[PDB]
Write a protein that binds this ligand. Structure first.
Ligand SMILES: Cc1cc2nc3c(=O)[nH]c(=O)nc-3n(C[C@H](O)[C@H](O)[C@H](O)COP(=O)(O)OP(=O)(O)OC[C@H]3O[C@@H](n4cnc5c(N)ncnc54)[C@H](O)[C@@H]3O)c2cc1C
Ligand SMILES: Cc1cc2nc3c(=O)[nH]c(=O)nc-3n(C[C@H](O)[C@H](O)[C@H](O)COP(=O)(O)OP(=O)(O)OC[C@H]3O[C@@H](n4cnc5c(N)ncnc54)[C@H](O)[C@@H]3O)c2cc1C
Ligand SMILES: Cc1cc2nc3c(=O)[nH]c(=O)nc-3n(C[C@H](O)[C@H](O)[C@H](O)COP(=O)(O)OP(=O)(O)OC[C@H]3O[C@@H](n4cnc5c(N)ncnc54)[C@H](O)[C@@H]3O)c2cc1C
Ligand SMILES: Nc1ncnc2c1ncn2[C@@H]1O[C@H](COP(=O)(O)O)[C@@H](O)[C@H]1O
Lengths: 239, 313, 387, 386
């Protein structure tokens, strides 16, 4: 009976229509509606479906950024997650935050909270990275089940179907494990009105990356964020 | 810095993955012995091809049973174990599912921030990628001891499959890790809406028996087959395929409009396709505005000519 | 203390669910149901599963016990997908409200409880073929006869009229015509499967076509005395008290539709070119969109104000009848302009705006017409100035 | 949180003072001042004393440091009494705003400070005989010329033009006609008794006749480099920036006069009789009254909203232009309507409504005409869909 840790990212709602900063340092990201990255929804969903099958004692939801990330943890709480963790980073350092720093945070956390399983979405739609899951799995030295379309416990092993370029490859993983949800995996549930209310009760410890023993300083840097711009030529200009 | 680069090959059923040629092209931009690691269970078949390839100084070969299904828990220390013995500046791959899976773990093992899906390269520390479903273009001055990154395939050109000749040394070894194991596989003309590659014919095809040319091609692009409302209405096809305002709203990767004038009502069902193709003999045909690419040409000459530039490639 | 136009995080998550269900599940079939005029059961059951219906029902009846404000933000979302389906599930708050504001402890756990257990509908029956606006010209008679009453008459235009488990029913208690309206009427809870009750065929209207509306004939219908709301003559107060909590929700419905009209007209205006330019580059069209945006934003706040006043314990007759009159009005103005901007396409039945024009007209008629709203506002207004 | 539509207890206090001033001191003399048109110096001073003027100045500089939502409160109450009076007062916030949002501490302590210590006036100089709505069309020239600039040109329609201690001035500091708005304009503070400054005759308008509105020319007026607002060429950004915190208040001005129109009209309908009945008892007049009520309530909320938006940190541009647009239009509808209810009397100077109508037209013109407001809203609105 496992303990699951789901990573949820507060992103700029996909249905927003985004706009680039004039000074081209980044995009415009204040007062702009945010939500839970839709892969995270699918991850929260699987944590809860596992719980439902009685293969999981608990589910913690976790989020890294400003205090607004609490709205995101409250959604996951509403969906079935048992309790939250917010890892406060001021909007300042949040801007220069990325999967590396997060993976470290989660690695430290999964270890700290004696968990068997870490659930992330495949990728985040803001930075389009697809790294955190993988990267967390490296820092814990656990196996990773990336882009999952299907999941099963076979005891102290996970059977993981995953979406690869030609179709679906299947894997088996020793079971402290790390799995990143793919589109195909499930249909996320609605935050049910009753449960939105019930989730306002459930707890959320709020902490710092500094505590867990993680740095944050980053040798990446964004230079700019601009805007997007015979049949023998054509198959050449698709290739 | 004395700057070597290393491309991680991708491959199967004794065949190099195309996206690997695209990555080799990007590698040469950095200037410095492109060495390329081919790991797996039956390597050299494929290692022999890389040797014929243009721009590849070394072909490092790592043959081991344990690499069945190229698991990133095995290949990660494989890759660190080369990097210790050679000290590369750069380590990259084609941004496929294989490449996407492997590299961020490598980064985490090296403790460097990796960069995903690059589309250009200002220089060896500066790369360009896309964010927000590609609605912006971000540019990154990575400053890491090691540069780890994947490469959008159709952002670069496949370098010549033959051309240069390249030495091939045995790669350094790793100990089987065995926390993961590969088990199984299953590979694959899609349903229309879910798909990533749509072909559609307008009234310009002239009959439903004429749509054979659009299937011909939508098996080469393992693709979906839709149409306009004017191709449906004329008897050519049934209703569940009509793309447009009264039909299935779609927006996959690739949309081909064949003999489609491009009325606002049909553009409403697909102006959100990532990439849009336009073969239509009239040059002042509304469809051209919205198509990234297109030709002012007879479709019965241009289309069966395309199905013959993808039987081989 | 302090003005605030920002939601609770709880309301945000409500709005987000309401909105996920609206865009995802209602819209993609809303034309289909408008075309067939079929009652939208799967959606009503889904909305009920999501907790979006019967939202006023108090906690001690297994309800959520939520505000008028919450209903309004929810129902603006449902309306944006379709006012036919929003009206359907709005019919429940309408039928329920009297019982919530005027029913005893057994009445409440009986008729409200069941709504908590399955998804059943209820309706509010007041309007008759001879009176709608002049509620005090209701002539459906109700006679005491032992332990119960004998209801005789005919009710018209009842939402959920053929789909309801039970009805709030207002009927003429006192034969004396000198009787003051305020004391002349009794209001009941009347199960729908009572003998005597004859539900009519579906009414075919120009708009909100998938909503169920029909006449009902009551003949010799036995209503148990312990389903009378407060007493004899009491009905009129009861029926009138209800509106405070429901008029805001109807207004919030209208803006839903207006917002839909605005988005549909704004998307098209960014695609269609005329004379070598997008329609938005035609100052007249921008001017149009500006004004639509103005009317929506104020309509929105107005219903937000009325919902807040009643939620604050105050009564809201003034503000609520402001919100309905304005919302009703601008929903219509916005429907036609959306049609106009779309042009020829807008007048066609496969584009989504034409339905809005047809759906919209209702908002200047039910739940109190544009005229009687202005009498209500004028009366509250005038009273502020007299001794 | 939640929504709230209740003033804070301290706000009610402001409102109470402002109402009592407006009704006890402004109303009794507002008609004489409308007839004569002399600048209402007593009531200004008086507003100044009660703290209903320069509300935006931070406590830093001995101001009361209130937000836009407070300034709107008070301005509606003043305007209910008289928009001529209330305009002259808001004139000072117009002038202040560019310095408030964009001055350094010297510039603020110096030019806002003095307003704290006595009831000095000040004015906003942007409009010109050739450009008003089109601010990037202003031709008044500033040439850099040492540790100072030289101002040349003509401004026009300046509230407090001839009653001010200093001016926000905006001028064309880049002579290359190809240069953008963003780089072409410099914004200055300019002491009024500077040589060169020639103040014109009082202008004679339809309404708000007690307000001082006049023209003014600049002939080699010297202005120190110490008085430039953010730097050379930041004039536009600056001038623009003021509008977020002023327009909401102009709209509350409009709502005040609307409220007054409706009050007069309602009192009269309750006491006038025709065909045997109080005007109230004609369905037409009732419907009029109700429609006017609607408009006001809505107009008020619109401004209350814009103000709160800006007080809450964020740009209120879309919201403030909606409030201006609508409050301004419905003010004009209410006033002509209020005249209508009073009938013959209504058209008469010995009654209070005829004045309202003449006052209210201005609210569709200054601070951005009804049309310009609508361009702004269309712009804000439309950008949200790409
Ligand atoms: C309410 C309404 C809703 C509608 N909804 C839809 C919708 O859902 N989807 C939709 O598709 N339509 C819809 N329509 C119809 C739409 O307006 C047009 O009829 C449609 O887009 C045009 O269809 P088409 O391009 O296939 O045919 P045409 O517009 O006739 O296009 C034929 C094109 O083929 C080219 N051509 C002919 N021969 C050749 C050749 N051999 N080689 C190359 N090119 C050739 C011609 O140059 C021409 O441009 C709707 C209309 C209405 C009124
Ligand atoms: C009593 C009064 C006091 C004033 N006080 C001050 C003050 O103290 N400080 C100050 O700086 N200014 C002041 N002004 C100037 C005032 O703000 C301007 O009159 C206003 O900005 C409109 O400019 P304009 O008069 O030059 O009209 P114009 O800009 O010439 O406008 C003319 C007409 O064309 C319309 N129009 C203009 N451009 C467009 C276009 N873009 N598209 C569609 N329609 C357009 C306008 O809406 C209007 O109907 C004051 C004006 C008045 C009347
Ligand atoms: C410049 C001027 C010149 C004039 N010259 C002449 C003249 O030479 N000879 C002459 O006889 N008169 C003259 N008059 C008087 C003028 O005709 C009246 O003012 C006019 O008839 C309106 O009547 P009232 O002023 O008494 O308004 P009231 O009767 O008091 O009505 C006031 C308002 O209530 C409305 N109202 C009244 N009854 C009803 C109703 N039953 N239903 C709905 N609404 C109602 C009115 O329309 C008006 O809006 C003049 C007036 C003016 C202003
Ligand atoms: N700031 C963050 N907080 C929590 N989880 C995150 C964060 N960023 C990324 N993740 C997780 O990593 C997944 C993909 O992120 P990325 O690698 O940024 O595409 C998301 O779906 C999350 O589950």
């Amino acid at each position: 009976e496992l303990r699951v840790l789901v990573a949820v990212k507060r992103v700029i709602d996909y249905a927003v229509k985004i706009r680039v900063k004039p000074d081209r340092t980044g995009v415009v990201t204040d007062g702009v509606k945010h939500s839970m990255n839709p892969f995270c929804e699918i991850a929260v969903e699987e944590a809860v479906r596992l719980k439902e099958k009685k293969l999981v004692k608990e589910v913690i939801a976790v989020s890294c950024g400003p205090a607004q990330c609490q709205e995101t943890i409250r959604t996951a709480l509403a969906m079935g997650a048992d309790r939250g963790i917010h890892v406060e980073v001021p909007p300042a350092e949040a801007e220069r935050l990325g999967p590396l720093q997060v993976a470290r945070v989660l690695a430290k956390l999964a270890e700290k909270e004696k968990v068997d399983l870490v659930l992330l979405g495949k990728q985040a739609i803001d930075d389009d990275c697809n790294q955190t899951g993988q990267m967390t799995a490296g820092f814990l030295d656990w196996p990773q089940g990336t882009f999952a379309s299907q999941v099963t416990l076979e005891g102290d092993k996970l059977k993981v179907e995953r979406a690869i370029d030609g179709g679906l490859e299947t894997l088996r993983l020793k079971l402290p494990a790390v799995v990143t949800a793919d589109l195909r995996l499930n249909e996320p549930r609605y935050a049910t009105l009753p449960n939105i209310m019930k989730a306002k009760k459930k707890k959320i410890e709020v902490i710092k990356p500094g505590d867990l023993g993680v740095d944050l300083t980053s040798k990446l840097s964004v230079i700019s964020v601009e805007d997007p711009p015979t049949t023998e030529d054509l198959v050449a200009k698709l290739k | 810095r004395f700057q070597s680069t290393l491309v991680i090959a991708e491959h199967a059923n004794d065949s190099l993955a195309p996206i690997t040629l695209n990555t080799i092209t990007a590698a040469t931009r950095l200037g410095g012995e492109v060495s390329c690691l081919v790991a797996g269970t039956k390597c050299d078949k494929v290692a022999q091809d890389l040797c014929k390839v243009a721009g590849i100084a070394k072909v490092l070969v790592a043959q081991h049973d344990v690499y069945k299904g190229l698991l990133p828990e095995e290949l990660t220390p494989l890759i660190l174990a080369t990097q210790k013995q050679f000290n590369y500046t750069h380590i990259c791959a084609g941004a496929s599912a294989f490449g996407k899976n492997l590299l961020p773990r490598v980064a985490a093992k090296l403790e460097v921030a990796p960069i995903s899906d690059i589309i250009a390269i200002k220089s060896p520390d500066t790369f360009v990628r896309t964010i927000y479903a590609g609605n912006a273009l971000c540019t990154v001055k990575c400053d890491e001891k090691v540069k780890v990154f994947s490469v959008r395939g159709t952002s670069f050109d496949a370098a010549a499959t033959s051309g240069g000749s390249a030495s091939s040394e045995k790669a350094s070894s790793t100990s089987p890790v065995e926390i993961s194991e590969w088990l199984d596989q299953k590979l694959t003309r899609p349903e229309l809406t879910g798909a990533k590659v749509v072909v559609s014919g307008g009234r310009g095809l002239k009959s439903g028996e004429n749509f054979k040319l659009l299937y011909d091609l939508a098996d080469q692009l393992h693709a979906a087959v839709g149409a306009s409302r004017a191709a449906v209405d004329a008897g050519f096809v049934p209703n569940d395929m009509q793309v447009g305002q009264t039909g299935k709203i779609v927006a996959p990767e690739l949309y081909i409009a064949v003999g489609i004038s491009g009325a606002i009502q049909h553009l409403a069902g697909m102006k959100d396709s990532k990439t849009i193709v336009a073969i239509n003999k009239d040059p002042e045909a509304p469809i051209f505005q919205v198509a990234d690419y297109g030709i002012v040409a007879d479709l019965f000459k241009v289309v069966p000519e395309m199905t013959e530039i993808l039987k081989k490639k | 203390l302090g003005f605030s136009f920002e939601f609770t995080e709880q309301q945000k998550e409500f709005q987000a669910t309401a909105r996920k269900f609206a865009r995802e599940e209602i819209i993609p079939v809303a034309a289909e149901y408008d075309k067939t005029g079929e009652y939208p059961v799967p959606l009503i059951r889904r909305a009920w599963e999501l907790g979006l219906m019967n939202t006023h029902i108090p906690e001690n009846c297994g309800g959520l016990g939520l505000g008028t404000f919450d209903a309004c933000l929810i129902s603006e979302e449902l309306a944006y997908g379709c006012t036919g389906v929003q009206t359907a599930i709005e019919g429940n708050s309408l039928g329920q409200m009297p019982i919530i504001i005027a029913g005893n402890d057994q009445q409440k756990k009986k008729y409200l409880g069941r709504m908590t257990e399955e998804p059943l509908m209820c309706a509010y029956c007041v309007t008759e073929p001879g009176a709608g606006s002049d509620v005090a010209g209701i002539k459906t008679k109700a006679e005491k006869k032992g332990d119960e009453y004998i209801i005789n008459g005919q009710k018209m235009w009842i939402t959920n009229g053929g789909k309801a488990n039970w009805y709030f029913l207002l009927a003429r208690s006192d034969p004396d015509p000198k009787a003051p309206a305020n004391k002349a009427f009794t209001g009941f809870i009347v199960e729908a499967d009572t003998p005597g009750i004859q539900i009519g065929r579906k009414e075919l209207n120009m708009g909100q076509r998938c909503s169920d509306t029909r006449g009902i004939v009551f003949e010799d219908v036995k209503v148990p005395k312990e389903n009378v709301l407060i007493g004899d003559g009491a009905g009129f107060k009861v029926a009138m008290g209800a509106f405070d909590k429901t008029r805001p929700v109807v207004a919030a419905g209208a803006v839903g539709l207006a917002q839909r009209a605005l988005d549909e007209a704004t998307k098209y205006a960014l695609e269609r070119k005329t004379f070598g330019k997008l329609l938005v580059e035609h100052q007249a069209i921008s001017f149009m969109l500006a004004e639509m945006a103005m009317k929506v934003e104020l309509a929105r706040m107005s219903y937000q104000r009325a919902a807040w006043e009643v939620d604050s314990g105050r009564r809201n007759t003034y503000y609520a009848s402001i919100a309905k009159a304005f919302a009703g009005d601008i929903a219509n103005q916005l429907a036609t302009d959306a049609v106009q901007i779309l042009g020829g396409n807008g007048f066609n039945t496969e584009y989504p705006v034409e339905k809005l024009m047809r759906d919209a007209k209702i908002y200047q008629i039910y739940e109190g017409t544009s005229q009687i709203q202005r009498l209500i506002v004028a009366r509250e207004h005038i009273d502020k100035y007299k001794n």
